[PDB]
Design a protein around this ligand. Structure first.
Ligand code: HEM
Length: 153
């Protein structure tokens, strides 16, 4: 439900993330976990890293942030034709990891935050509108799969 000009926007600003996906993904994860400590509890391997400084000191956490943003970038480059990518994600997060949909809301907000934090003055208002629509589309399509499963919610 984005226009082509909106998708262009999304994928242009995503180039800034690709310049250093690990650093971006670490920062996303930290924003999520520090703003919403209940999210950290879902990660058995990270749940002992309760503070920003502890999180930052883990290459394992940074590599998971790398996994997360690489997955999301591949989905964004499908410009909404992402059923096959998003299916397994929704299903593992509902059924295996037990992630309520509001945690996808929190990580979408965290991405917007981290874009402005790392690129102050370079994440323009048109780009924030288009990225926000792309994250909404992502989490909306995951929410429809959660609803099939009856998970949550
Ligand atoms: C942009 C949104 C997200 C993306 C693209 C994403 C992607 C991934 C990927 C690729 C994996 C590994 C494969 C899999 O198990 O499906 C994974 C695992 C996992 N995700 Fe997510 N994730 C997202 C959001 C979240 C959120 C919001 C949480 C909770 C706050 C979460 C919790 C987990 C957990 C607990 C695992 C298993 C980690 C482990 O023990 O190795 N995810 N995620």
């Amino acid at each position: 439900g984005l226009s082509d000009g909106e998708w262009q926007q999304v994928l242009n600003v995503w180039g800034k993330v690709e310049a250093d996906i690990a650093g971006h993904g670490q920062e996303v994860l930290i924003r999520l976990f520090t703003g919403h400590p209940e999210t950290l509890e879902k990660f058995d391997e990270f749940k002992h890293l309760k503070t920003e400084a502890e999180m930052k000191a883990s290459e394992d956490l940074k590599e998971h942030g790398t996994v997360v943003l690489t997955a999301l970038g591949g989905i964004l480059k499908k410009k909404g034709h992402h059923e096959a990518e998003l299916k397994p994600l929704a299903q593992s997060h509902a059924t295996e990891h037990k992630i309520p949909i509001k945690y996808l809301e929190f990580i979408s907000d965290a991405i917007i935050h981290v874009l402005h934090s790392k690129h102050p003055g370079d994440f323009g208002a048109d780009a924030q509108g288009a990225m926000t629509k792309a994250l909404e589309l992502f989490r909306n399509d995951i929410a429809a799969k959660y609803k099939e499963l009856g998970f949550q919610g």
